[PDB]
Design a protein around this ligand. Structure first.
Ligand code: SAH
Length: 290
């Protein structure tokens, strides 16, 4: 199906590296991360659907839980407040379908991604679910969201679901500044990211480690209030999530043919140990535009 292209004024030297980690067919990825392709951890509580694959169910439940945190923290998330939404680093597109279902009167849902294979998959799912009129896909670096069409229609809602970690500090700055200009006051930003809880001096395009404080500063420097900040999911749940991903890799990619899946196994093992030692956590950040 159709994807719109958006100019890159500045040069993200890191972009082609990020693209290569997501370049493999969705048909392969399905066997590793589940049939809905959620790719930023899971919440494994009593509201999780027991009939879907744990990765699909825990992934959806994680997104739902973040909206509950945003709501409790006083985010403007009523059905009448969300007319335009953006999914920044949208992966295979599960959040686009989630947003379309949760906000059936949301006029415009923009997904931005640098991975063509991921967007071509998302395009097929959006097309087959009949959401093509509302959901728009952009082959577009997060730093270039300033050039997305119809600037007169402001963003009410922005999602950074495990995409932020791939950004250079410069791309993070350019993305947050551009989002600030395109988002109306009281617009909600929903962030999930793996952040380090130690000084980074001591240290899958997994470079550009960040901290809660580094992310907090990037938000407040670019006209966003942080209204909720906490560990989510728990280190225990994230280790469990990596466990399920590793079990799928052991089953389907035992002899580590594919370098991207070998790299993911390494991160699953190595980052799970960092989570065990409490050197890092998954964090939910809810912010709003000033
Ligand atoms: N500068 C950038 N601009 C756009 N997308 C980016 C980006 N850096 C990383 N990404 C994207 O961020 C995603 C990280 S994986 C997470 C995918 C999706 N948010 C989910 O929760 O399932 C990938 O799709 C990657 O291509």
């Amino acid at each position: 199906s159709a994807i719109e292209v958006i100019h890159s004024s500045t040069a993200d030297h890191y972009q082609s590296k990020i693209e290569s980690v997501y370049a493999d067919p969705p048909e392969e990825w399905r066997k590793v991360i589940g049939n809905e392709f959620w790719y930023q951890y899971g919440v494994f509580d009593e509201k999780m659907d027991p009939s879907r694959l744990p990765l699909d169910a825990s992934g959806r439940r994680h997104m739902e839980y973040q909206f509950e945190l945003a709501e409790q923290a006083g985010a403007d998330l009523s059905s009448q407040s969300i007319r335009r939404a953006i999914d920044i680093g949208c992966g295979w597109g599960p959040v686009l379908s989630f947003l379309a279902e949760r906000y059936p009167h949301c006029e415009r849902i923009d997904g931005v991604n640098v991975s063509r294979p991921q967007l071509e998959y998302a395009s097929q799912v959006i097309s087959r679910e009949g959401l093509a009129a509302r959901v728009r896909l952009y082959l577009c670096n997060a730093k270039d969201i300033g050039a997305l069409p119809d600037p007169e229609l402001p963003y009410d809602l922005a999602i950074f679901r495990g995409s932020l970690f791939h950004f250079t500090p410069q791309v993070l700055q350019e993305t947050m500044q551009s989002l600030a200009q395109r988002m109306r006051p009281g617009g909600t930003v929903v962030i999930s990211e793996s952040l380090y809880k130690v000084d980074l001096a001591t240290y899958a395009a997994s470079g550009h480690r960040k901290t809660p404080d580094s992310l907090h500063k990037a938000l407040e420097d670019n006209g966003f209030d942080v209204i909720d900040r906490r560990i989510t999911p728990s280190n225990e749940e994230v280790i469990r999530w990596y466990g399920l991903v590793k079990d799928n890799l052991d089953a389907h990619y035992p002899d580590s043919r594919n370098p991207n899946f070998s790299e993911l196994r390494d991160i699953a093992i190595n980052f799970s140990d960092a989570l065990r030692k409490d050197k890092a956590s998954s964090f939910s950040f809810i912010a709003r535009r000033r």
